[PDB]
Amino acid sequence: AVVKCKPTSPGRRHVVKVVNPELHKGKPFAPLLEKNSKSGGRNNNGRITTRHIGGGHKQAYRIVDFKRNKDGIPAVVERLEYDPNRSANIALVLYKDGERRYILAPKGLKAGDQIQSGVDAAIKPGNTLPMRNIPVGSTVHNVEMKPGKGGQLARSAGTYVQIVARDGAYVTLRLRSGEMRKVEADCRATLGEVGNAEHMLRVLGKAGAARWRGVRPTVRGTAMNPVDHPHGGGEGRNFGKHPVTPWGVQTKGKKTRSNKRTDKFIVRRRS
Amino acid sequence: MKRTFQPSVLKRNRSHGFRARMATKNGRQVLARRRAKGRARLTVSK
RNA sequence: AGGACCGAACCGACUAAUGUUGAAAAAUUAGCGGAUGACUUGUGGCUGGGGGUGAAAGGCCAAUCAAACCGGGAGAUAGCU
RNA sequence: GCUCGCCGGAAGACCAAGGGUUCCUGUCCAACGUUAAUCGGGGCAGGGUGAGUCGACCCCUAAGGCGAGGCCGAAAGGCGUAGUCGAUGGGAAACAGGUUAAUAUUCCUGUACUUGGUGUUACUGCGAAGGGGGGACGGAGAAGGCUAUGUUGGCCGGGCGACGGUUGUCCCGGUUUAAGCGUGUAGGCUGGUUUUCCAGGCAAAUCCGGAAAAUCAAGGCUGAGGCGUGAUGACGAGGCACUACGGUGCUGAAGCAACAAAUGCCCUGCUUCCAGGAAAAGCCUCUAAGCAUCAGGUAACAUCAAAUCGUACCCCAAACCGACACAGGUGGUCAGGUAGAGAAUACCAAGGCGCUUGAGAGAACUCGGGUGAAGGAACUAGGCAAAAUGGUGCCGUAACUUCGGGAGAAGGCACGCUGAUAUGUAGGUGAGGUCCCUCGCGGAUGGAGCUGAAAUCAGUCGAAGAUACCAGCUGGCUGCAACUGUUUAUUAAAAACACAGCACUGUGCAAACACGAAAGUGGACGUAUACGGUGUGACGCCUGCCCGGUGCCGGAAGGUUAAUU
RNA sequence: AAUUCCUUGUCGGGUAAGUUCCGACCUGCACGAAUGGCGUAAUGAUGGCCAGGCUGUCUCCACCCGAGACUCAGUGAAAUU
RNA sequence: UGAGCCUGUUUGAUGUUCUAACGUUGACCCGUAAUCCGGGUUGCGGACAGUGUCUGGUGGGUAGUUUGACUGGGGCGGUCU
Incomplete structure (x- = not known):
């Protein structure tokens, strides 16, 4: 929800917060963490190359899955989490064979839900299919630009894309900026919006x-x-x-x- | 008041030492010039 | 809970007097601001001169900066004293 | 040698960085020491630093450096893979007493501990450059159990006081003991065991992960402190005999309880918040190639080894940075008594010092201070400077407001000492005795002893009872910036810079942009709710007309126009 | 008016007396709407003005306590000519 | 479809198709104990993109320089045969 703070001090008068009583209160999954060091905008020559960067809080990196290429094995959602490296939440999912991974969180997804991927998965939020197998006029997110590369479009908070037409071996899409683009029909996308x-x-x-x-x-x-x-x-x-x-x-x-x-x-x- | 010189042996040696001079082309020219002049002490290595 | 309140250690420099061949090539005495935060501090590392860094004052880069220090062109030129 | 004064969260004690003989002893007073000198951190000569457990060296990595092949560049050279270095971080082990002119966890005495090699016995599946575990991590808050430490009693040894009293409810001093080994408490976390199956952990796995059954409900890890032993030991006022005045040898009393109590330990714990809080090795487990008589692994004994370098002295200062024996600068640890909220302030303890020219006199003038009749800003550019207010508890408090504030608004009242309530009150701590118990560092009841606020009533002294140090002056009307912050080291701290909020514009990812002859790198392990540039500056009501000039965006019919032919 | 030269413009309040301050008028030499316009509670070692208490700032200076200045012994500079 | 040339000959323009030069900061295998590099297979582009020589436009981002004399002081005004 969105909450206002009370004017008990001059620095609290104009603060609005976002509170979600569903994220984990604890430590993240350890086998999927790495190190991440800061730069200050400097390059290998030691020169400032982008201005107005420096300082902050220490952060660790979470390895997130953008390819979604483990087909035929369903999974279950375990918990939603917080990630300081992006503007969207992530989810921890468990596979029927005993493996865990990280993915982006769509809208309307809670613990205990089933997800699947492949060329024969149902058309419901959280599933991954090639755009050759998605109806025209659908809403998708985390879209690839080349077959087998990984999601690169519509990865921020509250973003989506539309499939507007199809011809030959290409598909036509509308982006959040108001632009129309072509991508191959073998590229992958996930149903729903972030x-x-x-x-x-x-x-x-x-x-x-x-x-x-x-x-x-x-x-x-x-x-x-x-x-x-x-x-x-x-x-x-x-x-x-x-x-x-x-x-x-x-x-x-x-x-x-x-x-x-x-x-x-x-x-x-x-x- | 605080002054300019603040000693430190590790920094002295890592800056103006024999191996530091030998690590590049111009330090070797410095050494050649000093040898030609005939100095008793060649570097700060003690 | 708080870039909240009074106030020592710690970080600063608004007013007056002394000093000006000074105890000191920027200090002393009596008062003064902040003091859980955009805070302060020890050790090491990176950025090199028409270049670096700058919550921006032509500020700082070893008591030197509207273009550092050292060695060379070099006995530069001087219708001037 | 006796008296006097000063510091005492330091002007005391111990270190890191830095310095390198400044350390102790004998001798000398030319130069050095802002004066003399028999003195010195001064000249000359000798002596002094003792480690398996303290550091360094060593195993492991962070930011970053170097970099075989490689990519790139007129030469010189630049950037990087596999690797190799680099602490301010992680990794085995010691305590108390005694001793020298100068060393002490190193030397002596007493009692301990850790890691490797060889050999003998008994059993046995061992093996990594690989998989898994652990090491392993933020800010703030709160209260329960302890210790370091202090006070008062009891016990032991000594005194009966230079001038009135002092055989007592009187005065002085002591009452200390470690590491290791054993018991596993206050408390914290977690359900235990057995069997079957599986697209996961680059191959395998008895290990990790996932799924299904039956059984038992209490098993496991962590943990300050207290208690026993170490200790028939050591230490201890005093006394017994010799003194070159530094000591020698022996002997040696008591050596208990209650209360108070940390910023230190349980605590890497518990609760809560968003800005979401290092890497690798040492250590424990599982297997592949391979060996299977062997090699190796586990346990109990005997034995050998633990090398090399630092160890003196100063360290808020006469020994480091300032040309000086300079009113300046410099990181960590220790924390007694009374009054006090306190690491502020006043006087003291242990300890350390009186700052390297003196002796007189008591003119003008300069510096730092105390007091002042009547008046009370008349001074001055300006209340500059000086004078004044100042604590706890309780009454009581306006315009305006973004409803939090303004507010400690303003203005008042009480405050010492003795006695009674109560020969010490309300509260806190808590022994002997009696019961139960799965028998222990247990549970219930009980109140001896110790400690101890705040209030009311009644008397009493002074001019004054927040009496010393310490410790806000208050109100009214206006310009600027909304606020906390930053700035010209060394004449300007502000209305200047930044700020949360607003708007225009560029950018579809091999992104715009920037450092680079290039290779490459940041933006970013980010993806239009993201990133770069430009102007305005919380919040409320708002932001009107002009496209002639200069920029930018779109159009392509006509006119002019380069190399080339 | 941080903007207004003529200028101490004209009217009202405060003072015995007010070129500064507060409220109005409009003749804006030469205000004006994101190189923003008009308001605004709280915050300021920010600029201007008025009161209470306080006083050696003052009429107008007097006395006392310490460190120098003065005399005696020791050591012993400087700018300038 | 524009010029020669008689449906035949060679060079131009616009367009659709192709693969073999060239690109790949797409996927898999090897050197190998490797997110650099090289080779192999395969998808997507494709004579476009990009580089060398020559050539028109823009270019205070950067660099070298100029901006006259007389004068009852210099500037403004006036003058220079």
Whole structure:
């Protein structure tokens, strides 16, 4: 649910939280954890390459299954969990042969549910099929771009995709950005849409909240000197020039896509 | 008040040591110049 | 519960006096701000000069910065004293 | 040698980093020491550092470095696989007493402990570069059991007081004992055993994982403390005889209880929250190639080994960083008494010091302080500076408001000592005795002894009872920024920067973008509820007209236009 | 008015007397709506103004307690010419 | 379907199909005890993408430089044959 905090302190007045009384209160599955170290935006040359990154809380990595290629053996959901590396929850599933794995959580999935994969699975949420075997007009998530590679589309919280048509050996899809695209019909997808649709109703309420997640302050270019930015200078508050990036290119309208190898798979750009 | 020099043997040796100088091409030029001049002490190695 | 409240250790530097061939090439005395957090501290590591880092003051890079130190071109040029 | 003064959460005690003979003894006063010097961290000579258990070396890894082949670059060189290094982190084992001028968990005395090799006996399925377990991990809060430690009694030894009293309800001192071995408590967690089957753990598995039956309900792991032994020992005021004044040899009393009590231990525990909290080896288990008379493994004895390097001294300072015997800087551990909420503050204990020029006199003026008649900001750019308020408990408290606040708003009243309630009250702790018991570090009842607030009534002293150190001044009207934060080391701390919130725009993943002649890397082990750039700056009511100029987005009919032919 | 030169504009309140402060008027030399407009409880070592208590800031200075300055013995500089 | 040439000859333009150069930061096997590298098999693209020489456009991101004299001081004004 979504809950407001009471104004007992100036830093609690404008905080809205998301609370789910269904996630595990305990430790995650250990055989599926790895190490994850921070960078600060530096590369192998030691130079800052992406700005405004640094600090935060220690995190461990969960190995999640995006391929879903263990066919013919049903599974059961055990518990939902928390993952600090993404914006969606995950689920721990047990197979009839005695194996466990991690997957993304669809909407409407609770403990004790059955899931299956293959070319002969039922059409219900949580199942994985090739798009050759899914009706036109369905809603799917975690869609592949090449056969056998792994899900790459619609992986955030509350996202989905539609199958709009089919011809030959290709399928046509609509993306959350308003774009139409072609992918091979042997690619895989999972039924339903991702969960945690209320992740966008939270208000942090103070700067410490942003610091906790690893975000450093942003400095405006009009508050600098003319040797640090194309915007700096002036005796007061003066702009008198067209906005540009810190490296001279014009923001606010100019386009930056140039890839001729892929243009055959776009049917209409986002509107 | 705090001053500039703060000693540390490990850092001294890892920075200006004989093996550090030998590890690259220009440290060997430094050694050649000092040998040509005829110095009694060649590096900070004690 | 809290980037909550009064206040020592710890981190700072708003006011006055002394000092200015000083006890000190930035300090002392009496008052002053924060003090569970965007907090503070020990050891090691990475970023090199038209380059680095900067919650942005032309700030900092070994008492030196509107372009560091050292050795070379070099006995640069000086219608000037 | 006697008196006086200062510190005592340090100006006491022990270390890491750094320094390297500054340590003890004999001798000397040229230079050094801001003065003299018989003195010194000064000159000269000799002496002093003793380890299977303390560190280092050693086995294992983190950030990161190097890197056979490899990829890339005019040369020089760059980035990386298999590997190899790198602590601030993980991995076996010792306590008490005595001793020198200088060392002590190392030397002596007494009692312990751990890891390897060889040999003899008894039984037996052993074997990894592989699978599984464990090592193994966050912030805040709370209260129960203990110890370190202190106070008062009892016991032992000594005293009967320089000036009134002191044979007593009087004064002084002591009352200490470890590691190891045995018992397994306060408490924490977890159902136990047996049989069958299986698309999983790159091959196998008696191990891990999943499924099905029957039986029993109590089995297992963890754990401070207390108690016994160590100990017929050691220590201990005092006394017995010699003194080069440093000691020698012997003897040696008592050596108990109650109360109070930690920021230390049980605790890597329990409860709760979101920002969701390292790796590998040592250790325990399972098998493959292979050996099966052998090799190996398990247990009890005898025996050998545990090498090499550091060990003196200073360490909030005269020995380290500041050119100085410099009012500055520097990480960890120890934590007594009275008053007190307290690691604040005042006086003391153990311990350590009086800071390396002195002696007189008591002018103007400078520095740091105390008191002041009448007036009370008239001073000054400005209440700058100085003066003033200051504790606990209880009455009582406005406009405005985002309903939390404003608020400790403002303004008042009590406060010492003695006696009674009560020869010590309410509460806390808790022995002897009596019962039960699956017999023990047990359960029920009982109240001796110790400790001990707060309140009411009645008397009494001073000018003053929160008497010393310590310890908010309060109110009214207005500009700016919403708030906590950050900034010009060394003349500017702010209305400047950041901030949670809002909007425009780019980006379909070999993403936009950035560091790189390139290989590659970050963005990200992320996927439009995600990521980059730009402007505004909580919240409330709002954000009107102009596309002529300069940018950006779309169109392609016409006009002009490069190399090439 | 952090914006208004003429300017101490004109009217009202506070003072015996107010170029600063508070409330209004409109003649905006030269305000104005995300290089945002108008409000706003709480917070500020932020700028301006008014009161109570307090006082050596002042009329107007007087006395006392310590460290120098003065004399005696020892050691023994500096800028400048 | 545009030029020669008589349905025959060779070069152009637009378009649909193909595989063998070329790409693969798709899947499996080996060197091997390996998320680099190389080879093998197989899907998807495909004469497109990308690179070398030449050539038109944009380019304060970066670099080297210029911006006159007389004058009752310099600047503004005026002048320079």
